[PDB]
Write a protein that binds this ligand. Sequence first.
Ligand code: 30R
Ligand code: ZN
Length: 515
Amino acid sequence: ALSRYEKWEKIKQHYQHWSDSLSEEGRGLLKKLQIPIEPKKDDIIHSLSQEEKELLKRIQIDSSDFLSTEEKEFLKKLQIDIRDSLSEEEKELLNRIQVDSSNPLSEKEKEFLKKLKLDIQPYDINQRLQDTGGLIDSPSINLDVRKQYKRDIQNIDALLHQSIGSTLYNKIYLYENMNINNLTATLGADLVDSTDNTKINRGIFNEFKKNFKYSISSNYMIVDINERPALDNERLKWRIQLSPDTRAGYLENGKLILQRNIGLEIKDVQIIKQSEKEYIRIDAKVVPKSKIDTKIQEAQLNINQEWNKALGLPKYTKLITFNVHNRYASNIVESAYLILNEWKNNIQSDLIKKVTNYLVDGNGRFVFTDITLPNIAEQYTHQDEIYEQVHSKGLYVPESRSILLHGPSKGVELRNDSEGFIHEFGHAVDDYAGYLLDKNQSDLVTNSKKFIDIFKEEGSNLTSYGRTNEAEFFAEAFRLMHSTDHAERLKVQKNAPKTFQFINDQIKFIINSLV
Ligand SMILES: Cc1cc(S(=O)(=O)N(Cc2ccc(CN)cc2)[C@H](C)C(=O)NO)ccc1F
Ligand SMILES: [Zn+2]
């Protein structure tokens, strides 16, 4: 055994001059990176009108279809403060109406929350870096805050000037404990076996290992000099080897902060045992970011050439985009091949071809990303207003004729990423149908005389989320009609006959469009 405390001491000495040279502005900066600054709950609540308090008190927050997971969590802690001023029956009653309460929000509820989200952003450098993938000019937060982020990130980059060096880099390992849900909320919930939680589901594991070949860090990784025993939710244990010129800084209690924008090549992925629980070891080696970007671009070129051919498109149509910057990079890239495969397997070749030609005619894109959708230009160039921007698993944006699919998050009511894609392709089918109906006044076919009536009657029969509005109802019905599960296709035909009819009609109408 090679001594944890001597390893520590030697890395501390390597950075001792650097540490002692830090101004205390420098020190403040590093602590702020480590410990984000949260919103002041009191002030938020103090600023609500009495009518807004009453609303926030009674509102069900997971009914939202646009808030991030971070925003959703904060709001719930905010509901609590609001509520601790009540009777025990009030509190119990208000929680009593929560069981059969999967329903869509009222319009005055949604409008309120959409504006409230501008006021509950933490100031959190590493989160801002990961969310935007390093592209911090993205107009998804207030301009003034955005500029404060830029100054801080620039100053941190300038503090991290000293590399680990030629002597240390192949003598030490660095460690990082991770929650599986921070890479894939989908595989996360089902990689710990259900029979036994101390075991790893070998099938999912082979899937995860399958193309986990590279990884990108767009923020500043905090790593441990010595391995720390896992917490509850920490089933991923990274062991990282740096490169000689990897720049880093010493943090107290045996940590290193690494420079942003590095690449990691996955060298090995194993199941290992640590006190009768199973964990996943991930061995990784720091490489230059550009190397991995080169691999991403070649994959993008190759998936487009493959799909340009299969779709009867010009050879150099830029159709599929990899917008990839985060720790599960290579899976995003590989997952897109499989998603597009399930798409061609479950939808008529003529429908797919005629609609995708329409998207390409409007300079459209299939964007596969691991940054948040508000930070994708296919959304933000057409949605100036932050209160109108959407976080979700998937989005169709008609103004840019693009489908956006966010890899890392897990969609409610979804079995996988392929299902999510097909629902988005449902919005695009709705778009083209409305255009064919009326080529100058290009509107959505769900905004038509007919379909509104159909929705007013059958709008409650299918999925809970189908009850939101005409657009979503259509999209869900379209998704269920092309499910791999046979039973799903028929429940639509039986529980909502007119919609079934109406969609199959539009599909006919589209395929029957020509030269
Ligand atoms: C069920 C489902 C969800 C999504 S989604 O999660 O990506 N999504 C909506 C959303 C629904 C439900 C909830 C919480 N119950 C939150 C958000 C977005 C806005 C959407 O309508 N894109 O067209 C995509 C495909 C799906 F089949
Ligand atoms: Zn939708």
